[PDB]
Amino acid sequence: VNSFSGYLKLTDNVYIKNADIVEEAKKVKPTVVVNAANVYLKHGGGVAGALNKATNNAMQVESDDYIATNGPLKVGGSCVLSGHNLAKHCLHVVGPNVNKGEDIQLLKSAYENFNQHEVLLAPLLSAGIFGADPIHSLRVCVDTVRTNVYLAVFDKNLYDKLVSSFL
Ligand SMILES: NC(=O)C1(CNc2ncnc3[nH]c4cc(Br)ccc4c23)CC1
Ligand SMILES: [Cl-]
């Protein structure tokens, strides 16, 4: 039993809710919140901009030190950093950005990072400003993630479409 509330169960291990991931993280304080990161950990907009704003820019400060030491992530890759006031840990995961021409096949590799964590609060990777079809992202999530994932979808209209079209 965990503290996530109001989710629709899609499969054995995948759950979904119309929610602001920032507000959900602040309420649940999950062990792991997933950020929709880019390779530079520049948290300017979308989910990343919102999460970073909620940390009062502490996420960005920590991220800049990480990049200065380690260099950029790979598309499809991840790193574990602090969750600040939102979670114990933040798993920064880089899905392909279609608006940059990146290979959508890397979306499966991106979701594989979730399997290193028993339970996660997450957005749909490569959705939103990353330009992928969220219906496809949900399909890849369900077919790739084996650990327990609680998906927060900000847009109510999109949430209803994701549920109603789910196979
Ligand atoms: N834009 C979308 O509808 C999707 C991706 N964005 C988010 N997904 C889940 N929680 C989120 N909290 C946010 C807060 C701010 Br401010 C901006 C964006 C998001 C966000 C669901 C596809
Ligand atoms: Cl977004």
Curated annotation (Swiss-Prot):
It is a multi-pass membrane protein. It comes from the Viruses. Changing residue 164 to L: In strain: Gamma/P.1. It catalyses: Thiol-dependent hydrolysis of ester, thioester, amide, peptide and isopeptide bonds formed by the C-terminal Gly of ubiquitin (a 76-residue protein attached to proteins as an intracellular targeting signal). Residues 1-167 form the Macro domain. Inhibited in vitro by GRL-0617. It is found in: Host endoplasmic reticulum membrane. Responsible for the cleavages located at the N-terminus of the replicase polyprotein. Participates together with nsp4 in the assembly of virally-induced cytoplasmic double-membrane vesicles necessary for viral replication. Antagonizes innate immune induction of type I interferon by blocking the phosphorylation, dimerization and subsequent nuclear translocation of host IRF3. Also prevents host NF-kappa-B signaling. In addition, PL-PRO possesses a deubiquitinating/deISGylating activity and processes both 'Lys-48'- and 'Lys-63'-linked polyubiquitin chains from cellular substrates. May form homohexamers. Interacts with N protein. This is Papain-like protease nsp3. The gene is rep. The chain holds residues 1025 to 1191 of 7096 of the full protein.
